[PDB]
Amino acid sequence: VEVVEERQAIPLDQNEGIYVQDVKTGKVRAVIGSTYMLTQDEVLWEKEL
Amino acid sequence: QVYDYRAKRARVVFGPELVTLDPEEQFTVLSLSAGRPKRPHARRALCLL
C-alpha cells in the first residue's frame, strides 16, 4: 500500500457545514452539524450563486 | 431581544440584566428616527427604550 493524501480536521457546529460530492456516483450533498472528516471518495463541492 | 440560530428561537429581555449570548445568537438591531428633528435612518440601536 502507498500513501496518497492526509485528510485534516474539519471543525463544524450546528447550522454549519460544507458541500461535498460522492465521486463514485456524482452524489453532491451538504454535510452539516458535527465535525466530519471526508471519507475515501468524497471531495469538496463548490456552490454557485 | 436576540434570536438564536442554533435553537431556532428568539428570546427577549429588559431591565437591569446584562445579556449573555450563545454563539449563534444575534442582536435585534433597530433603526431609529433621529437627527436634530427627524430622519428615517439615524442613531441605530438595539437598546429600545
Residues in chain A: 49
Residues in chain B: 49
Location of C-alpha cell 435585534: B28
Q: What is the DSSP letter of B32?
A: -
- HEC string of A1-49? CCCCCCCCCCCCCCCCEEEEEECCCCEEEEEECCCCCCCCCEEECCCCC
Could you tell me which residues of chain A have a Cβ less than 8 Å from any Cβ in chain B? 13-15
Tell me how far apart the alpha carbons of residues B47 and B40 are, in angstroms, rounded to a whole number. Answer: 17
Q: Within a 10 A sphere around the Cβ of B1, how many other Cβ atoms?
A: 13
Resolution of the coordinates, Å: 4.9
Which contacts (CB < 8 Å, 24+ apart) does range A6-9 have? A7/A37, A7/A38, A8/A37, A9/A35, A9/A37
Closest to B3 measured CA to CA, from B32, B20, B28, B23: B28
Cβ–Cβ below 8 Å for A15 and B6 = yes
Nearest chain B residue to A14 by CA: give it.
Answer: B6
Q: What is the DSSP letter of B11?
A: E
For A21, A26, B17, the CA distances from A48, given in Å and listed in that order, are 14, 17, 44
How far does the CA of residue A37 sit from the closest CA of chain B (Å)?
22
Contact list, A13 vs chain B (CB under 8 Å)? 6, 23-24
